[PDB]
Design a binder for this molecule. Structure first.
Ligand SMILES: OC[C@H]1O[C@@H](S[C@H]2[C@H](O)[C@@H](O)[C@H](O[C@H]3[C@H](O)[C@@H](O)[C@H](S)O[C@@H]3CO)O[C@@H]2CO)[C@H](O)[C@@H](O)[C@@H]1O
Ligand SMILES: CC(=O)N[C@@H]1[C@@H](O)[C@H](O)[C@@H](CO)O[C@H]1O
Ligand SMILES: CC(=O)N[C@@H]1[C@@H](O)[C@H](O)[C@@H](CO)O[C@H]1O
Ligand SMILES: CC(=O)N[C@@H]1[C@@H](O)[C@H](O)[C@@H](CO)O[C@H]1O
Length: 606
């Protein structure tokens, strides 16, 4: 179809399957194994990418071209890597992936949305779809084509350090929030076949349903550990949202570090091939987690040859190496040359990776669009995040007795008010993990509005706002305050650092709430990724709001505190009385919550 050097795979008018087949039939083994290899930007160079025919790059958490880098700097990085891939014999574009899990969260000046637990509180799948839409734009602002989201874990024990990444303990809520996928990727057409991958084009990103499967089921919420549950319960709790993701054309699936009844997921042929591929008919590509094949063995990394064999034979398509790429390629090449891994398995992996690349338009638009840089941090997206933050808030108490005046909503005009607590003026704490750094960080780490700044923006000009991080009781009682807003809670964490058997917030937190509430009527805003021991905070407070990890737009908190909007959020998880109850979910015999799933008080807008 027409010039003498026509190559069908380069013809954008041709069907995806024809282009895939045409390309695959041209590739050497080294080209094929290169497609299967994802490396960290930190080990990438132009020569590395060309010589090893690399298929994909990622930024792990905190892996950035420099601190404070602009959108244009990200595009220039990504395009520099792409130029090297495009210079190979076959010119196959790389796909660049990142954890854009509550916005484009590694990037300075990106809108940071509430973490998933708060989004579960909203019970609003359309809101979540819009968040997906905005997030795709902000990822494409930085030149990135692929986001490692959504996390569709159903967290069954809040002692898990990734509980905040789960929309709920109730899989129906998780299933509903799979609407993130067509936000990020675009809506699938009416005719669509479930399990096929889909991305609408260059203003959308490939998505990733993660982590397959039972990541939120692990014993004692120990991260990466064993999920002990029969097949009926795996299928009833942990699996259903994967079906919803297939119906919405999710492009990729990332495998869990966890084990199901003692078998590592990264080595689980029955589930990865037998179930996801052969029963759900998934036709996108399956990616490992970070050194996930290494962690098949104990100790991790102790037989990388076996890790390669076991994972590829299990049915993984792309391996997030992410550093030891020479070793990886060398080992897989030797297994193929030895007949230990059949070429059919290699060709299936490559078919899937190429299918996603062609489908999304990556061959037509391999490079960044500089006109998209202005999407990063856009005020429209911030307004969305502010709506989401406000809808996520769950009002747990609004008066000490049944006869007291409701504290909330607070009046915006008062002579003098106090804002206090470790979390009142700390943007990093309000965002939590996966924000700028992998683990999150403390203080003013990006562009956003703290609780204190939001109060100052909201109140009448005649209201004097005093900030004291940790005032003593006598300071509050002598201060002449009309009321206080006190914000306290968890510090940022991710993954294993967040695994926590006591679930008691750090001090000073409770001591500050007791000092403040002791001197003036107080509204306590609890910042956490999960339920935490709360009876003492409740005892001290006139009003208490569970604000989860609301992100960069702290005006979402004050929009409810001052009554511009009513409180509508409802608990997406059970709030335990004691950590000795755990795990404790609905249907259990010992179900005795402090607050049940679905609990939340309301107010009306003033
Ligand atoms: O990010 C891609 C997928 O990765 C894991 S999280 C992953 C972080 O992205 C990464 O920065 C981090 O690196 C640490 C290594 O694990 C350690 O071996 C060394 S000692 O220290 C570095 C410090 O950064 O590793 C993390 C996993 O351990 C998630 O599970 C996926 O959801 C995510 O999409
Ligand atoms: C399946 C799995 O990953 N299990 C591990 C096991 O090594 C260890 O005994 C346990 C307690 O550390 O936590 C985890
Ligand atoms: C009062 C108490 O024991 N707090 C601990 C804390 O120090 C530790 O960081 C956390 C995470 O494991 O578990 C809890
Ligand atoms: C907390 C509160 O005042 N809630 C009120 C509710 O009692 C009332 O029924 C409703 C009428 O629309 O408006 C709201």
């Amino acid at each position: 179809h027409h010039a003498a050097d026509y190559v069908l795979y380069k013809d954008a008018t041709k069907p995806v399957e024809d282009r895939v087949a045409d390309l695959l039939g041209r590739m050497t083994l080294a080209e094929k194994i290169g497609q299967m290899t994802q490396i960290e930007r930190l080990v990438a160079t132009p020569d590395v990418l060309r010589d090893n025919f690399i298929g994909s790059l990622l930024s792990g958490g905190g892996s950035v071209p420099r601190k404070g880098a602009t959108a244009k700097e990200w595009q220039d990085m990504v395009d520099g890597f792409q130029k090297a891939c495009m210079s190979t014999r076959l010119g196959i574009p790389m796909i660049y992936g990142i954890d854009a899990v509550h916005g484009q969260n590694n990037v300075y000046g990106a809108t940071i949305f509430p973490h998933n637990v708060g989004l579960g509180a909203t019970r609003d799948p359309y809101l979540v779809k819009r968040i997906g839409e905005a997030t795709a734009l902000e990822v494409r602002a930085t030149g990135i084509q692929y986001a490692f989201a959504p996390c569709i874990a159903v967290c069954r024990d809040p002692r898990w350090g990734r509980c905040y990444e789960s929309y709920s303990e109730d899989r129906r809520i998780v299933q509903s929030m799979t609407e993130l996928i067509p936000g990020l990727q675009g809506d699938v057409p009416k005719d669509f076949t479930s399990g096929m991958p889909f991305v609408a084009g260059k203003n959308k990103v490939a998505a990733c349903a993660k982590h397959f499967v039972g990541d939120g089921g692990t014993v004692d919420g120990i991260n990466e550990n064993n999920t002990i549950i029969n097949r009926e319960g795996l299928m009833n709790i942990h699996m259903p949202a994967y079906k919803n993701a297939m119906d919405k054309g999710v492009s990729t699936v990332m495998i869990s570090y966890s084990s199901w009844n003692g078998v590592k997921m990264h080595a689980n042929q029955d589930l990865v091939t037998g179930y996801l591929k052969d029963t759900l008919k998934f036709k996108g590509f399956v990616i490992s987690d970070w050194e996930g094949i290494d962690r098949i063995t104990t100790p991790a990394g102790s037989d990388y040859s076996y890790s390669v064999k076991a994972s590829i034979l299990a049915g993984l398509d792309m391996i997030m190496v992410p550093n030891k790429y020479q070793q990886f390629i060398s080992i897989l090449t030797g297994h193929v040359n030895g007949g230990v891994i059949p070429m059919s398995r290699i060709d299936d992996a490559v078919t899937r990776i190429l299918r996603v690349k062609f489908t999304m338009g990556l061959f037509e638009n391999p490079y960044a669009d500089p006109a998209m840089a202005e999407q990063l941090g856009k005020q429209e997206h911030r307004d969305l995040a502010r709506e989401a933050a406000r809808k996520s808030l769950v009002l747990l108490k609004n008066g000490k007795t049944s006869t007291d005046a409701p504290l909330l909503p607070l009046p915006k005009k008062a002579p003098k008010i106090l804002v206090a607590g470790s979390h009142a003026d700390n943007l990093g704490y309000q965002c939590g993990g996966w924000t700028i750094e992998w683990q999150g960080d403390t203080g003013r780490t990006t562009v956003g509005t703290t609780i204190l700044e939001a109060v100052k923006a909201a109140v009448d000009p005649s209201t004097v706002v005093v900030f004291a991080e940790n005032p003593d009781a006598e300071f509050v009682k002598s201060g002449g305050f009309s009321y206080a807003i006190v914000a306290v809670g968890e510090h940022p964490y991710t993954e294993t650092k967040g695994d926590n058997l006591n679930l008691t917030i750090p001090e000073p937190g409770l001591s500050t709430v007791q000092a403040v509430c002791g001197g003036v009527r107080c509204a306590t805003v609890l910042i956490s990724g999960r339920p935490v021991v709360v009876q003492p905070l409740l005892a001290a407070s006139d009003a208490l709001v569970a604000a989860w990890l609301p992100g960069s737009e702290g005006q979402g908190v004050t929009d409810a505190l001052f009554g511009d909007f009513g409180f509508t959020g409802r608990l997406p998880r059970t709030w335990f009385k004691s950590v000795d109850q755990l795990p404790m979910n609905v249907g259990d015999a010992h179900y005795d919550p402090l607050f049940r799933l679905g609990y939340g008080l309301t107010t009306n807008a003033t």
